[PDB]
Write an enzyme that holds these catalytic residues in place. Sequence first.
Site, PDB file in Angstrom:
ATOM      1  N   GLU A 178       0.864  -1.207   0.000  1.00 55.61           N
ATOM      2  CA  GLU A 178       0.000   0.000   0.000  1.00 55.61           C
ATOM      3  C   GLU A 178       0.890   1.243   0.000  1.00 55.61           C
ATOM      4  O   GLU A 178       0.551   2.231  -0.690  1.00 55.61           O
ATOM      5  CB  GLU A 178      -0.943  -0.059   1.193  1.00 55.61           C
ATOM      6  CG  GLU A 178      -1.997  -1.152   1.086  1.00 55.61           C
ATOM      7  CD  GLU A 178      -3.063  -0.908   0.020  1.00 55.61           C
ATOM      8  OE1 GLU A 178      -2.978   0.113  -0.694  1.00 55.61           O
ATOM      9  OE2 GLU A 178      -3.945  -1.786  -0.140  1.00 55.61           O
ATOM     10  N   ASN A 208      -7.827   8.316  -5.735  1.00 56.06           N
ATOM     11  CA  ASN A 208      -8.623   7.256  -6.397  1.00 56.06           C
ATOM     12  C   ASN A 208      -9.375   7.883  -7.587  1.00 56.06           C
ATOM     13  O   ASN A 208      -9.651   9.108  -7.594  1.00 56.06           O
ATOM     14  CB  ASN A 208      -9.559   6.576  -5.385  1.00 56.06           C
ATOM     15  CG  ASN A 208      -8.850   5.960  -4.189  1.00 56.06           C
ATOM     16  OD1 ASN A 208      -9.266   6.158  -3.039  1.00 56.06           O
ATOM     17  ND2 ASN A 208      -7.767   5.230  -4.436  1.00 56.06           N
ATOM     18  N   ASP A 248     -12.519   7.776  -8.187  1.00 57.09           N
ATOM     19  CA  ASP A 248     -13.820   8.352  -7.765  1.00 57.09           C
ATOM     20  C   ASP A 248     -13.621   9.717  -7.089  1.00 57.09           C
ATOM     21  O   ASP A 248     -14.657  10.284  -6.641  1.00 57.09           O
ATOM     22  CB  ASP A 248     -14.572   7.363  -6.880  1.00 57.09           C
ATOM     23  CG  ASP A 248     -13.925   7.104  -5.525  1.00 57.09           C
ATOM     24  OD1 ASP A 248     -12.825   7.654  -5.235  1.00 57.09           O
ATOM     25  OD2 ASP A 248     -14.558   6.424  -4.752  1.00 57.09           O
ATOM     26  N   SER A 277     -11.945  10.160  -4.236  1.00 49.74           N
ATOM     27  CA  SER A 277     -11.524   9.923  -2.850  1.00 49.74           C
ATOM     28  C   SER A 277     -10.002   9.791  -2.849  1.00 49.74           C
ATOM     29  O   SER A 277      -9.426   9.707  -3.934  1.00 49.74           O
ATOM     30  CB  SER A 277     -12.211   8.713  -2.297  1.00 49.74           C
ATOM     31  OG  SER A 277     -11.747   7.562  -2.964  1.00 49.74           O
ATOM     32  N   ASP A 331      -6.605   7.903  -0.609  1.00 54.53           N
ATOM     33  CA  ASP A 331      -6.093   6.898   0.342  1.00 54.53           C
ATOM     34  C   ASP A 331      -4.918   7.525   1.105  1.00 54.53           C
ATOM     35  O   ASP A 331      -4.028   8.127   0.485  1.00 54.53           O
ATOM     36  CB  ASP A 331      -5.600   5.662  -0.411  1.00 54.53           C
ATOM     37  CG  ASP A 331      -6.674   4.819  -1.078  1.00 54.53           C
ATOM     38  OD1 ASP A 331      -7.850   5.025  -0.774  1.00 54.53           O
ATOM     39  OD2 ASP A 331      -6.280   3.853  -1.809  1.00 54.53           O
ATOM     40  N   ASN A 333      -9.121   4.956   2.910  1.00 54.90           N
ATOM     41  CA  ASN A 333      -9.848   5.697   1.871  1.00 54.90           C
ATOM     42  C   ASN A 333     -10.800   6.689   2.561  1.00 54.90           C
ATOM     43  O   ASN A 333     -11.491   6.306   3.505  1.00 54.90           O
ATOM     44  CB  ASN A 333     -10.553   4.671   0.970  1.00 54.90           C
ATOM     45  CG  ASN A 333     -11.145   5.264  -0.286  1.00 54.90           C
ATOM     46  OD1 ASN A 333     -11.287   6.461  -0.381  1.00 54.90           O
ATOM     47  ND2 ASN A 333     -11.523   4.433  -1.252  1.00 54.90           N
TER      48      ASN A 333
END
EC number: 3.2.1.17
Length: 129
Positions: A35, A46, A48, A50, A52, A59
Amino acid sequence: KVFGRCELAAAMKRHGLDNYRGYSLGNWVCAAKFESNFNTQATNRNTDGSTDYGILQINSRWWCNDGRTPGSRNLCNIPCSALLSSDITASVNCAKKIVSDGNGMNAWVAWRNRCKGTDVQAWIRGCRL
Ligand code: NA
């Protein structure tokens, strides 16, 4: 902060992630590796819109507030910035809620794609725990 592998394993263990919801410590270290490469300050946008945040790429769509993720929740009741701290307490506490949500560590697509079913014990090999 860029954690060492065993350094992060010790910190996750102290914070009770070892065998949390039945996931051995190496699963958590492996997830953190893929990650964030063990960097608390990792951020990734992301598709969309959003974001992380932190060692486990938590998220803003569901778990933290960043003020820029329309229609999102803050289920860990934390600012996403708390997930970037050198102190992983907020990341671990929020990770415990995520992994309890019903899909276990499949919530972390990088865990499913890169750690699940692998020899995750290798991630804690050599560590004094
Ligand atoms: Na949010």
